[PDB]
Amino acid sequence: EAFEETHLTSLDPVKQFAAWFEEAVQCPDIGEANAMCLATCTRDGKPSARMLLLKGFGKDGFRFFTNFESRKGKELDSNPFASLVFYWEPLNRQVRVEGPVKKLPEEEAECYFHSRPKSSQIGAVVSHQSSVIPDREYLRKKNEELEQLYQDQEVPKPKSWGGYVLYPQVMEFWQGQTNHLHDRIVFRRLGPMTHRGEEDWLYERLAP
Amino acid sequence: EAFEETHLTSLDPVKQFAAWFEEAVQCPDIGEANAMCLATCTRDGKPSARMLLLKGFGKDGFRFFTNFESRKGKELDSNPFASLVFYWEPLNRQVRVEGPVKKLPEEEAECYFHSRPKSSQIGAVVSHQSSVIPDREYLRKKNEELEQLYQDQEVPKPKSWGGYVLYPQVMEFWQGQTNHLHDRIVFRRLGPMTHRGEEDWLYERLAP
Ligand SMILES: Cc1cc2nc3c(=O)[nH]c(=O)nc-3n(C[C@H](O)[C@H](O)[C@H](O)COP(=O)(O)O)c2cc1C
Ligand SMILES: Cc1cc2nc3c(=O)[nH]c(=O)nc-3n(C[C@H](O)[C@H](O)[C@H](O)COP(=O)(O)O)c2cc1C
């Protein structure tokens, strides 16, 4: 029941995530375990957020793909800092991730783009993400038109579409309790309460 | 199936939300329909996000309660701008809300605080939200101690704890489709594509 520090799994939060992620996949009550909210803001400080999907994670951090000329793409391409929220309601858990964002290698994006379903690939070409359009049939038309063009061919990845990777600086692990005393263990990159994790990671408990 | 403009419900997005919110409550597959992600950032432009609960909504906007001396409280109390994401997975819908944030009346917060369960009330007093603490038993101790103190009494609302209201400037209604051509209708406070809604609201369709 109790989410303890001396319990846990790893003092590396990336490995601790992997542990928590696995349990999320294993829960049949969770649809998309990799569904996350991605928060960005302008250099000025105008925040925005939308749902994404995590597309792989590792030592380098957390990967996700989108249009660069989209609202969030522009926000990142002038203010490369992001936050992530994972929420698993049935497990009553939350993971918050913060850090700077590097654009992924071009040819790496090529590889992934071509592993997506055919329909998904074409969708990326019709859609200038977050741009004003006249009506819904506009999209439906251009889509069926591109289906004809890339009949028995492969869709070239548009220059607009690629990936990002968030290098984690801060990682919170939130475990809700019925007594309202939620367990919060936060990792960041010493005082009597601050402890050392793996590498340059430090962890401490926060009040709920 | 198709989320149309000439379908919809109201040209007032607050009323359109009410319509979408009601369907979320009615769905038995949705636990907390009012569960939302709240994105804030520093004046500098350092974004952060966490799950909250919506606690009422109306003409004035969207209300939610927290500690003001919390991380997000401070971010708001120096940069009163926020974003909200509602995600209803079974309905495959997303609502994004953006606008400035006013702190709620003190006595209004008093009223609400005292309508929360006894345990919840005490929880607000033990917990200096987002502050470093030594261990989990620390909380558990102080909590049981305050239970003795407020035996057959009422908990005074701490000065730290209160509410906020986000006055909506932008409101996106996202409806996912299997063909990847997600319907996006965005309201904001004229061109050939921009249409007029109720009051000073304008709406347009965005590419997915
Ligand atoms: C569950 C879910 C997953 C999503 N995943 C992605 C994604 O991986 N990439 C993406 O570009 N948009 C994704 N979207 C759509 C975004 O929420 C958003 O509508 C779009 O990226 C435009 O964001 P922007 O207006 O902030 O640029 C997803 C939406 C939902 C509901
Ligand atoms: C479903 C859910 C609902 C929550 N609702 C609230 C809430 O209404 N108010 C609140 O202060 N924290 C709420 N929390 C906790 C926050 O996510 C977060 O841990 C806390 O507010 C500290 O935020 P901060 O560190 O950004 O200040 C909720 C958490 C979850 C998972």
Author numbering:
A (entry chain A), B (entry chain A): 46 to 234, 243 to 261
What does the primary publication say about this deposited structure?
The enzyme pyridox(am)ine 5′‐phosphate oxidase (PNPO), whose catalytic action yields PLP, is one of the key players in this pathway. This flavin mononucleotide (FMN)‐dependent enzyme, which produces PLP from PNP or PMP, plays an active role in vitamin B6 homeostasis. In both human and E. coli PNPO, PLP works as a regulator of its own production because it binds at an allosteric site of the enzyme, affecting the binding of substrate at the active site and inhibiting the catalytic activity (Barile et al., 2019, 2021). Mutations in the gene encoding PNPO are responsible for a severe form of neonatal epilepsy.
On the basis of this previous experience, we carried out co‐crystallization attempts with either the wild type or the R225H variant of the human protein and PLP. The R225H variation affects a crucial active site residue involved in substrate binding, but is able to bind PLP at the allosteric site and has allosteric properties (Barile et al., 2020). We obtained crystals with both protein forms; however, PLP was detected only in the active site of the wild type protein, thus a clear indication about the location of the allosteric site was missing. A substantial part of the N‐terminal end is not visible in these structures: the electron density map starts from Glu46 in the R225H and from Ala47 in the wild type structure. PLP binding at the allosteric site of E. coli PNPO results in the disorder of the large structural region made by residues 123–166 and also uncoils a short helix (residues 192–200), which contains Arg197 (corresponding to Arg225 of human PNPO) that plays a crucial role in binding the vitamer substrates at the active site. Our crystallographic analyses and the results concerning the proteolysis of PNPO N‐terminal region indicate that this region of the protein is very flexible.
